[PDB]
A paper describes a structure:
EgtD, an S-adenosylmethionine-dependent methyltransferase (AdoMet), catalyzes the trimethylation of L-Histidine to initiate EGT biosynthesis and this reaction has been shown to be essential for EGT production in mycobacteria and for long-term infection of murine macrophages by M. tb. Multiple X-ray crystal structures of Mycolicibacterium smegmatis EgtD show that EgtD possesses a Histidine binding domain and a Rossmann-fold domain, which affords ordered substrate binding of L-Histidine and AdoMet, respectively.
HD2 forms primarily polar interactions with the histidine binding site residues of EgtD. Specifically, HD2 forms a hydrogen-bonded interaction between an ordered water molecule, positioned by the Thr213 side chain and the backbone carbonyl of Ala205, and the basic nitrogen atom of the imidazole moiety. This compound is commercially available as a racemic mixture of L- and D- HD2 enantiomers. Based on the interactions observed in the EgtD complex with L-Histidine, it is reasonable to expect the L-enantiomer to be the dominant ligand. The pyrrole moiety of HD2 forms a 3.6 Å van der Waals interaction with the α-carbon of Thr163 and a 3.3 Å van der Waals interaction with the side chain of Asn166. First, HD2, HD3, and HD6 most closely resemble a Histidine amino acid as they all possess α-amino and α-carboxyl moieties, but the α-amino group is elaborated with a variety of chemical linkages. As expected, these binding modes closely resemble that of L-Histidine with the minor exception of the α-carboxylate moiety of HD3.
Author numbering: 1 to 321
The structure:
Amino acid sequence: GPVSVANHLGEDAGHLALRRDVYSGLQKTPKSLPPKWFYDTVGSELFDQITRLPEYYPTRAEAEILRARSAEVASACRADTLVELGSGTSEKTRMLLDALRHRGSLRRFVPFDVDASVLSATATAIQREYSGVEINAVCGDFEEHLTEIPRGGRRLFVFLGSTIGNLTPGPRAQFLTALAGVMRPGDSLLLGTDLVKDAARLVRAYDDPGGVTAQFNRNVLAVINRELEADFDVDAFQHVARWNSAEERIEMWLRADGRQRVRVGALDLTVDFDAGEEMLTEVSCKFRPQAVGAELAAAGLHRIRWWTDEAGDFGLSLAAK
Ligand SMILES: O=C(O)[C@H](Cc1cnc[nH]1)n1cccc1
């Protein structure tokens, strides 16, 4: 089947994004940075390791549900088109493509991510594995290009791994409304959400003893050093995995050991950390089963299936327009 890659991000859309977020976030109280900057190539290789740590259940837990329920997903949604908000490199992507193909209905695949080079490699791979699938890959972001996803057929939009947990409730409803807004009736969304559980287990999942997560968190300082010509003393920031009980969310902070004075050249800006000051680099919202379905409803989607792993750790929702 034919490939297409359509690119809607400027050649430097990523750099200007990085300059804006760092400039704004290094000047607020407390300092905060978006988590999307974790995922350069070094960072992406660290995230590949996190998914295989014993402490980090979410990848395994979702995998278990999908290894069991992918057929039922394909049966209930009847889609001929799989749209992934994500790069399409997962094993779980092949689970869902397998289900639609086994159902005799796999006609089209639409990966939707921001790195065109990842999309082009994904399309090549999928096009070799699945004869007779059209791979319409889209390079864009959620804030402006969800309308660039192709029309027609019955579409299953997929957004796994509790990625939506990276969105606090304000931006989260703003995303679900936009997505449901581009969905046609008969389309359906598959959404993974990590569930509230024992806080001791939540905190260990985000601070593994060897510190693979610690390097992942600190890696944000390396990306800023390199792409904005800053001088973070990366070794003098400490990984801190916090449980925010009232918002029911994990938080990833960097605590500054000793007063730091960092200068980001490309921005012509100097920031200051007091000794022990902590910067927010991620939130990882955990969910309750009723609150997920209710939130889907606010956006105009009606959950028809909810699915849990054998242990109750992770939830997969299937909702229709
Ligand atoms: O929330 C998560 O556990 C991860 C990020 C992360 C893993 N360990 C520390 N941070 N994730 C998954 C989708 C989007 C972010």
